[PDB]
Enzyme design. Structure first.
Site, PDB file in Angstrom:
ATOM      1  CG  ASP A   1      -2.142   0.960   1.027  1.00  0.00           C
ATOM      2  OD1 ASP A   1      -2.520   1.283  -0.125  1.00  0.00           O
ATOM      3  OD2 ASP A   1      -2.637   1.375   2.048  1.00  0.00           O
ATOM      4  CB  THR A   2       1.753   3.768  -2.501  1.00  0.00           C
ATOM      5  OG1 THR A   2       0.697   3.563  -3.452  1.00  0.00           O
ATOM      6  CG2 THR A   2       2.994   2.943  -2.956  1.00  0.00           C
TER       7      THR A   2
ATOM      8  CD  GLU B   1      -5.217   6.246  -2.299  1.00  0.00           C
ATOM      9  OE1 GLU B   1      -5.351   6.684  -3.463  1.00  0.00           O
ATOM     10  OE2 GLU B   1      -5.177   5.013  -2.014  1.00  0.00           O
TER      11      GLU B   1
ATOM     12  NE  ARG C   1      -7.869  -1.823  -7.812  1.00  0.00           N
ATOM     13  CZ  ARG C   1      -7.461  -1.248  -6.674  1.00  0.00           C
ATOM     14  NH1 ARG C   1      -6.914  -0.016  -6.665  1.00  0.00           N
ATOM     15  NH2 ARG C   1      -7.554  -1.951  -5.539  1.00  0.00           N
TER      16      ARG C   1
HETATM   17  C1  LIG Z   1      -4.120  -5.096  -3.061  1.00  0.00           C
HETATM   18  C2  LIG Z   1      -5.503  -5.657  -3.022  1.00  0.00           C
HETATM   19  C3  LIG Z   1      -6.580  -4.793  -2.869  1.00  0.00           C
HETATM   20  N1  LIG Z   1      -7.812  -5.308  -2.835  1.00  0.00           N
HETATM   21  C4  LIG Z   1      -9.006  -4.446  -2.525  1.00  0.00           C
HETATM   22  C5  LIG Z   1      -9.185  -4.393  -0.992  1.00  0.00           C
HETATM   23  C6  LIG Z   1      -9.550  -2.952  -0.739  1.00  0.00           C
HETATM   24  O1  LIG Z   1     -11.014  -2.829  -0.780  1.00  0.00           O
HETATM   25  P1  LIG Z   1     -11.755  -1.411  -0.420  1.00  0.00           P
HETATM   26  O2  LIG Z   1     -11.744  -0.593  -1.700  1.00  0.00           O
HETATM   27  O3  LIG Z   1     -13.157  -1.906  -0.076  1.00  0.00           O
HETATM   28  O4  LIG Z   1     -10.990  -0.777   0.694  1.00  0.00           O
HETATM   29  C7  LIG Z   1      -8.917  -2.162  -1.905  1.00  0.00           C
HETATM   30  C8  LIG Z   1      -7.582  -1.467  -1.528  1.00  0.00           C
HETATM   31  O5  LIG Z   1      -6.987  -0.958  -2.738  1.00  0.00           O
HETATM   32  P2  LIG Z   1      -6.439   0.526  -2.745  1.00  0.00           P
HETATM   33  O6  LIG Z   1      -5.317   0.642  -1.708  1.00  0.00           O
HETATM   34  O7  LIG Z   1      -6.019   0.652  -4.181  1.00  0.00           O
HETATM   35  O8  LIG Z   1      -7.605   1.465  -2.378  1.00  0.00           O
HETATM   36  O9  LIG Z   1      -8.739  -3.139  -2.919  1.00  0.00           O
HETATM   37  C9  LIG Z   1      -8.027  -6.698  -2.964  1.00  0.00           C
HETATM   38  O10 LIG Z   1      -9.239  -7.089  -2.961  1.00  0.00           O
HETATM   39  N2  LIG Z   1      -7.031  -7.558  -3.193  1.00  0.00           N
HETATM   40  C10 LIG Z   1      -5.750  -7.103  -3.214  1.00  0.00           C
HETATM   41  O11 LIG Z   1      -4.807  -7.919  -3.325  1.00  0.00           O
HETATM   42 CA   LIG Z   2      -3.224   2.962  -2.029  1.00  0.00          CA
END
Ligand SMILES: Cc1cn([C@H]2C[C@H](OP(=O)(O)O)[C@@H](COP(=O)(O)O)O2)c(=O)[nH]c1=O
Ligand SMILES: [Ca+2]
EC number: 3.1.31.1
Length: 129
Positions: A34-35, A37, A75
């Site tokens: 996690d970076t 934002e 994604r």
């Molecule tokens: C990195 C990662 C994120 N995610 C989802 C969980 C988080 O859900 P929520 O959007 O409900 O918080 C979100 C975090 O990504 P971001 O840090 O890009 O926001 O993406 C996964 O489902 N699997 C993964 O491996």
């Molecule tokens: Ca992020």
């Protein structure tokens, strides 16, 4: 795991890019990190670091783990390599990302990345300063 080709379409932020994969445009989200934002502290520094790494690369590769390949937003979830160097690891090693989002069965490179994080923390880099 195995590396597969992709090309950069556009750098987005600290932990996402738009890549062309199997000939189709997709957003990719970096596994196991996690970076901040862009609006957050070290956010712009993470974005810039990631941008430089993938834009300067002659060859971009994606490596999917053993589990889920796309998240709930569509994604791609991968380890991204820039001329053989893992973007995920490099961000962590520079204190520009935290190890995060470690889900069972999609965590092949967890310990590699936790080692990087420990070295960034020892050096008090960026997020750890
Ligand atoms: C990195 C990662 C994120 N995610 C989802 C969980 C988080 O859900 P929520 O959007 O409900 O918080 C979100 C975090 O990504 P971001 O840090 O890009 O926001 O993406 C996964 O489902 N699997 C993964 O491996
Ligand atoms: Ca992020």
């Amino acid at each position: 795991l195995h590396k597969e080709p992709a090309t950069l379409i556009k750098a987005i932020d600290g932990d996402t890019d738009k890549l062309m994969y199997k000939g189709q445009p997709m957003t990719f989200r970096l596994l196991l990190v996690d970076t901040p934002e862009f609006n957050e502290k070290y956010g712009p520094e993470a974005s810039a670091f990631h941008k430089k790494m993938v834009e300067n690369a002659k060859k971009i590769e994606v490596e999917f783990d053993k589990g889920q390949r796309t998240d709930k937003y569509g994604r791609g979830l991968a380890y991204i390599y820039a001329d053989g160097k893992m973007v995920n690891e490099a961000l962590v090693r520079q204190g520009l990302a935290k190890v995060a989002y470690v889900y069972k069965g999609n965590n092949t490179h967890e310990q590699l990345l936790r080692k990087a994080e420990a070295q960034a923390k020892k050096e008090k880099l960026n997020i750890w300063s």
